[PDB]
Design a protein around this ligand. Structure first.
Ligand SMILES: *[C@@H]1O[C@H](CO)[C@@H](O[C@@H]2O[C@H](CO)[C@@H](O)[C@H](O)[C@H]2NC(C)=O)[C@H](O)[C@H]1NC(C)=O
Ligand SMILES: *[C@@H]1O[C@H](CO)[C@@H](O[C@@H]2O[C@H](CO)[C@@H](O)[C@H](O)[C@H]2NC(C)=O)[C@H](O)[C@H]1NC(C)=O
Ligand SMILES: *[C@@H]1O[C@H](CO)[C@@H](O[C@@H]2O[C@H](CO)[C@@H](O)[C@H](O)[C@H]2NC(C)=O)[C@H](O)[C@H]1NC(C)=O
Lengths: 49, 72, 23
């Protein structure tokens, strides 16, 4: 549910759009994630491993 | 996540795309207020074959009818 | 609906440039 569950009840949202919104929150245009979704996923998988 | 019009991806300027079942709309995040998808609510970036989950629709340009009807 | 609205006019930039040229 992203961060919306901290206000009231949980609100559905797909994870890639939540990540795009987090990018938008730090001054990076949201097209960057959608153009580089696989690379970011692989980087996160390598980092957490 | 995006809407394709002429082979070019369209992303919402501020908001999330939404559909009630038949037509598509753009609205803000914390309140339901659908609006017609025009060329002022979206910005073009890239092409139509890089994004996963894109859909098809037509973005209404207010310039086209209002300028072509009068210019005749 | 709004309480306190006042009457005025909004200037459209496209209309003068259009009707002055397209005429
Ligand atoms: C989804 O929204 C669209 C847009 O308003 C609805 O289409 C309208 O339907 C009414 C009822 O038949 C018509 O009078 C309007 O002319 C339609 N709008 C347009 C732009 O043609 C549609 O009915 C909605 N669907 C549901 C299931 O609510
Ligand atoms: C959005 O519309 C385009 C334009 O028709 C679709 O592209 C067509 O895709 C089919 C199936 O792959 C091809 O047979 C056609 O030749 C394509 N059109 C052209 C002009 O080449 C596209 O598939 C549509 N999007 C979706 C998700 O169906
Ligand atoms: C802003 O303009 C509108 C119309 O130009 C005004 O509405 C008119 O008000 C008079 C006052 O009695 C009525 O006789 C007319 O019938 C109204 N016209 C319409 C179309 O409703 C409105 O009053 C103006 N605003 C202010 C604050 O004066």
């Amino acid at each position: 549910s992203g961060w919306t569950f901290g206000a009231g009840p949980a609100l559905q949202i797909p994870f890639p759009m939540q990540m795009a919104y987090r990018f938008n929150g730090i001054g990076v245009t949201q097209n960057v994630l959608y153009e580089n979704q696989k690379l970011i996923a692989n980087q996160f998988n390598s980092a957490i491993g | 996540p995006a809407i394709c019009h002429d082979g070019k991806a369209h992303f919402p300027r501020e908001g999330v795309f939404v559909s009630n079942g038949t037509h598509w709309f753009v609205t803000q995040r914390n309140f339901y207020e659908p609006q017609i998808i025009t060329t002022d609510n979206t910005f073009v970036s890239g092409n139509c074959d890089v994004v996963i989950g894109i859909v098809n629709n037509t973005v209404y340009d207010p310039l086209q009818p209002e300028l072509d009807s009068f210019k005749e």
